Design a protein around this ligand. Sequence first.
Ligand SMILES: O=C(O)c1ccc2c(c1)nnn2C1CCCCC1
Length: 301
Amino acid sequence: VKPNYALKFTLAGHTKAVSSVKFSPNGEWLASSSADKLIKIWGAYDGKFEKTISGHKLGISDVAWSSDSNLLVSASDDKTLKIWDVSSGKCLKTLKGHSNYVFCCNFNPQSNLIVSGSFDESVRIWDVKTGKCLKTLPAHSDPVSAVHFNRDGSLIVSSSYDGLCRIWDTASGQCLKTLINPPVSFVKFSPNGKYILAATLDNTLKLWDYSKGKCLKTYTGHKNEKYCIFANFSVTGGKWIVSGSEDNLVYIWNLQTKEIVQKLQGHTDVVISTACHPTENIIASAALENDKTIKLWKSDC
Ligand SMILES: O=C(O)c1ccc2c(c1)nnn2C1CCCCC1
């Protein structure tokens, strides 16, 4: 059982490296962020360019959607996050408090909170409605590379170049577990909240059992020794792990067997980010400056 992702559209418009692509929860849009200081919105199905959202003073590392698909949050080298109304393109709030680049961001499922991680080694939890910081967690001893809420919002997982992943109780800010030293470049909870997928800068993805603090699966064969490359759980068809790679390919693994099931050829630079559509077997991928495009791919399974 293998997927058959094939290229459907190639999207161009950003003028510097893309950093992150994300499909809206309602499936209608793809958002992209870039070192060019811009967010772009594209039709998720035909790639049609929709709008540019602008206001950050420096490049953007990440963007994330609210559960109702109406809001975006972005994390910027200007040391702020911004909350955006997607329909109007307007900045609703600027979240100030980090003392260096903000690298990662996510809403909780309820979408009343945002979590951020920064070069400043902290994780912050913000109130969406007021735009004020509720908690600053002294989370890591090196830049924070990823932050993600679990399925009900009760926990946050963070990762850092310090080699650690940490699980935090959202309401209290207490660290409930540290997974233990290669730099960790990405982390997220599995859909059921019981596992955690982590990328490290030694060409390795790992699936950890949260309750046991133990690694259950590793996924290798790709190249990842430099860039923050996200990894995804693909769940609409076959159960895969999806990731970009520094050899210009999208890698897709069987989650259970760890075997590579497809390598998507087409980009001409590092595939820095990938995202999986919430209902269709559709992948978005973005590549670095020799390539300059976002590609949309479709599989029958
Ligand atoms: O939906 C999810 O979050 C999810 C999480 C882990 C899953 C899964 C679905 N299907 N199989 N596995 C195994 C991974 C390897 C260890 C035993 C479980």
